[PDB]
Design a protein around this nucleic acid. Structure first.
Lengths: 338, 326
DNA sequence: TATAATGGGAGCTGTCACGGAT
DNA sequence: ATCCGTGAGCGCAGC
């Protein structure tokens, strides 16, 4: 109980193992039921998924958390069919149940498969949940006409699901599986070099060993993308009294010196506009975007003052120049430029 | 403390080790009737929810002392070496020998399957056995009586038999109760609570002892239970026991009452102790900033929160799709 | 997309005193 | 009685 592994082991360990006769019967019954769903879907004209779910819903029960009156309403129609038509409904119910049994029983393989996919950034149980997820799709597609034992076709979806999951849930930064795959072959080809060369590969060796379109630049580039973030709570010193974030500054937030200088700059800049008329200053405010943050074009400023752009443009120049003269007596604002 | 549940019992419910029944739905386990707030193990919950179905293995090569449709009891044997340790209806499983007596013996194989009931009158051309290859399919050579023997195993299910001739109004999976009409427009009715499994092959509506017991697990159970609790009432009951001679009784009643009173005076609802919407701290307070080295560094909270999301959406999909409870 | 494949893997060891629940 | 969970000095430096 304390060990969730042992718990799943006993939970599925009570489910007997299906014999070929039992397996063939169940898997066959599953297939028949699904096709019966098709025929019953057609006869009803309803959405095949909906009727599959109303059949299952009944199989599972309202115990599972499409209000339940719906599934009853449908089931009423489903049962208002003649005897022959209800036959396929009955078979489809039997198939949904056989689906469940085949799954529940063919899971010890999923364990014996995921036990070798561990140590890849995900725990046994997380991986198992993925392998079971894929297994349901595999059971939904498995055909006994092939005559291959379930283990054969099942493993494909059991390995794909876990392997896909490892590539989907192992990076704090979501990186596409194809990229992960390139990175994996980079390490594979690299290690080959490392063990052969008797030393240690470089950007340029692996690049050529990889093949065409592969250069040293690309190697380092791919490694840069592969770079993974580290924990801020990482221990510093043998005394666990310090952490990384303690020794990491804030660059974003206004630093009192920066905010102080901005307050001073805007004050002095205004004091410079006090050396102009409000028309000259206002023109500059809109044009430079001091009026309301948004800088307004000359045509807009001429729309505000009701003036030809040329006159607005020229008075803006006159105003800037007047500021320059005043500055040539002060140069107080230059300090803020720094 | 509020639900008068032990810490072990809590853990069992939250970590899915034992079911807690919220409505007994007429459930009898070991004779004793089932009550609300009762802890059932998995095996028990199965018997009460589904049924008792045990298959005893027959050593291929020996015939069956029992026949399809017959009923057996504990102390009675299916075959010379295999006995039934239970009573109920017994069904052949994978009969290896089909011998239709044409008023002839035919071998059964793994992939082969049968579509006729035992003791069925047949004529030339009808369908009796099917297989993957119709070239290897068995047909009805002439008029004859169906007979099946040498089953691989016998499923002795504790169920009841309800033969029918008219269309059924019950599909396999449904649950039934004594007197519930099953088929034949009122003629075929139930004889006990159970689960129905229409056998189109044998045209028999079987019912296996089973009720609609509501024995849930996890916080959903605890949340409903907490929501059902009436604080005012529980206060009264604890106060009355605060008048009991035993010192320990009054002690525990006081502590429980302290929790109850806390919820009453505060106005908080015990169900809030169960979480359905988890908050997430403003990302600034738990960031992944870029260090001077150019690398980024994240708080452990981020990897915890993501871990939950991975599991949650995984569950949402699995639930929405529907899949074995296990 | 199919030989068949069906109970895991690694354990931390040289404190202790107190309040609490069982 | 036993077991579980709780705390067990402050800085500075720590490459």
């Amino acid at each position: 109980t304390s060990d969730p592994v042992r718990q799943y082991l006993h939970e599925i360990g009570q489910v007997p193992l299906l014999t070929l006769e039992e397996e063939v019967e169940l898997a066959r019954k599953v297939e028949e039921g699904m096709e019966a769903i098709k025929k019953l879907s057609e006869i009803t004209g309803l959405d095949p998924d909906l009727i599959r779910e109303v059949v299952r819903a009944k199989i599972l029960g309202s115990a599972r958390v499409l209000d339940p009156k719906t599934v009853e309403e449908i089931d009423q129609k489903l049962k208002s069919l003649p005897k022959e038509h209800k036959r396929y409904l009955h078979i489809a119910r039997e198939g949904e149940a056989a689906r469940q049994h085949l799954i529940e029983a063919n899971l010890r393989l999923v364990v014996s498969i995921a036990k070798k996919y561990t140590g890849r950034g995900l725990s046994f149980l997380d991986l198992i949940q993925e392998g079971n997820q894929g297994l349901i799709r595999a059971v939904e597609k498995f055909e006994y006409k092939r005559r291959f034992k379930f283990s054969t076709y099942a493993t494909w979806w059991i390995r794909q699901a876990i392997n896909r999951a490892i590539a989907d849930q192992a990076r704090t930064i979501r990186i596409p599986v194809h990229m992960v795959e390139t990175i994996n072959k980079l390490s594979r080809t690299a290690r080959q070099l490392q063990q052969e060369l008797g030393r240690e590969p470089t950007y340029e060796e692996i690049a050529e060993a990889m093949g065409p379109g592969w250069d040293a630049k690309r190697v380092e580039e791919t490694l840069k993308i592969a770079q993974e973030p580290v924990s801020l709570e990482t221990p510093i010193g043998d005394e666990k009294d310090s952490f990384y974030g303690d020794f990491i500054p804030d660059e974003h937030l206004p630093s009192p010196v920066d905010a102080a200088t901005q307050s001073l700059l805007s004050e002095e800049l205004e004091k410079a506009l006090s050396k102009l008329s409000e028309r000259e200053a206002m023109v500059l405010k809109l044009r430079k975007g001091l009026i309301d943050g948004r800088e307004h074009t000359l045509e807009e400023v001429g729309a505000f003052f009701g003036v030809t752009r040329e006159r607005i443009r020229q008075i803006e120049n006159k105003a800037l120049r007047k500021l320059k003269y005043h500055e040539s007596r002060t140069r107080k604002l230059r300090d803020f430029l720094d | 403390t509020l639900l008068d549940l032990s810490a072990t019992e809590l853990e069992q419910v939250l970590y899915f080790s034992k079911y807690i029944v919220l409505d007994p739905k007429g459930a009898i386990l070991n004779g004793v009737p089932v009550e609300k707030r009762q802890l059932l193990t998995d095996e028990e919950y199965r018997e009460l929810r589904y049924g008792k179905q045990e298959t005893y293995p027959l050593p291929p090569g020996v015939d069956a002392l029992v026949k399809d449709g017959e009923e057996v009891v504990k102390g009675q044997e299916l075959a010379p070496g295999v006995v039934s340790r239970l009573d109920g209806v017994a069904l052949y499983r994978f009969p290896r020998r089909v011998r239709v007596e044409y008023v002839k013996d035919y071998r059964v194989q793994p992939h082969m399957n049968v579509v006729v009931p035992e003791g069925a009158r047949v004529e030339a051309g009808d369908k009796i056995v099917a297989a993957i290859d119709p070239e290897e399919e068995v047909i009805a050579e002439a008029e004859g009586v169906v007979h099946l023997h040498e089953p691989a195993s016998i499923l002795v299910v504790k169920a009841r038999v309800y033969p029918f001739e008219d269309d059924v109004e019950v599909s396999t999976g449904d649950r039934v109760a004594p007197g519930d009409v099953l088929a034949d427009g009122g003629k075929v009715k139930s004889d006990v609570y159970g689960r129905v499994e229409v056998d189109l092959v044998r045209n028999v509506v079987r019912v296996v002892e089973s009720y609609d017991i509501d024995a849930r697990m996890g916080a959903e159970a605890i949340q409903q239970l907490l929501k059902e609790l009436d604080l005012e009432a529980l206060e009264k009951e604890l106060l009355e026991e605060m008048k009991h001679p035993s010192r320990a009784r009054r002690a525990k009643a006081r502590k429980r009452l302290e929790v109850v009173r806390a919820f009453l005076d505060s106005g908080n609802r015990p169900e809030w102790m169960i979480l359905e919407a988890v908050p997430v701290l403003p990302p600034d307070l738990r960031p992944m900033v870029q260090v001077d080295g150019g690398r980024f560094a994240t708080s452990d909270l981020n990897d915890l929160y993501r871990r939950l999301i991975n599991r949650n959406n995984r569950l949402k999909k699995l639930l929405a799709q529907g899949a074995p409870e296990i």
